DNA sequence: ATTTTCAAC
C-alpha cells in the first residue's frame with residue numbers, strides 16, 4: 001500500500017546520535033535526509049512514500065534525493081507534497097541546487113525541517129538558506145513533534161515511545177532564533 | 185514510575 005520505504009530505516013542509537021540538536025555537536029560527519037511525500041494525481045488515489053537518504057556517483061544527501069526523485073518518481077500531471085527531516089541543514093551548493101529544482105518544478109512543494117544548522121555563522125551558508133526560503137521552501141527547526149515523528153517513521157523503534165533528550169527544547173529555541181535572524 | 189522537551193545558582 002502506502003507503506004513503501006526508500007532506503008534503510010535507522011537503528012535507535014544511530015538516530016539518537018545523528019538527530020541530537022546541540023547547535024555545535026562534534027563528530028556528526030553524516031547527513032541524514034528522512035522524507036515523506038504525498039503523491040496527488042487528479043483521478044487516482046493519493047499515495048505516500050517515505051524513506052532515508054545519506055551522503056554518496058558521489059552525492060550529498062539532498063542531491064541524492066533530487067536525483068532519485070527526478071529519475072524514478074516525477075510524473076506528468078501530478079502534485080507532490082514533500083517534507084524533509086535533515087540532521088544537518090544544506091550547504092550552499094545543495095541549497096542552490098534544491099532552489100533551482102523547485103523553480104523548475106511548480107508541482108513540487110517542499111517543507112524542510114532540520115535538527116541542526118550547518119555553519120549558521122557563515123554568510124555563504126546563510127545566503128543558501130535564504131535562497132531556499134525565497135524559492136518557496138519553508139525552512140524550519142525540528143522541534144519535539146518532529147523528532148517524535150521521525151522516531152515513529154524512520155527508526156526501528158521496536159514499539160518503544162520517543163524519549164526526548166535533555167536540552168532538546170533549549171537547543172530548538174537557540175536554533176529557531178538564529179534561523180529567524182538569517183531569514184529576516 | 186507522577187514513564188525522559190521545561191523544572192533554571
Ligand SMILES: C[As](C)(=O)[O-]
Nearest residue numbers: 031060088090091
Ligand atoms: C548538510 As550537506 C554537507 O549534505 O549539504
Ligand SMILES: [Zn+2]
Nearest residue numbers: 060090091094
Ligand atoms: Zn550539500
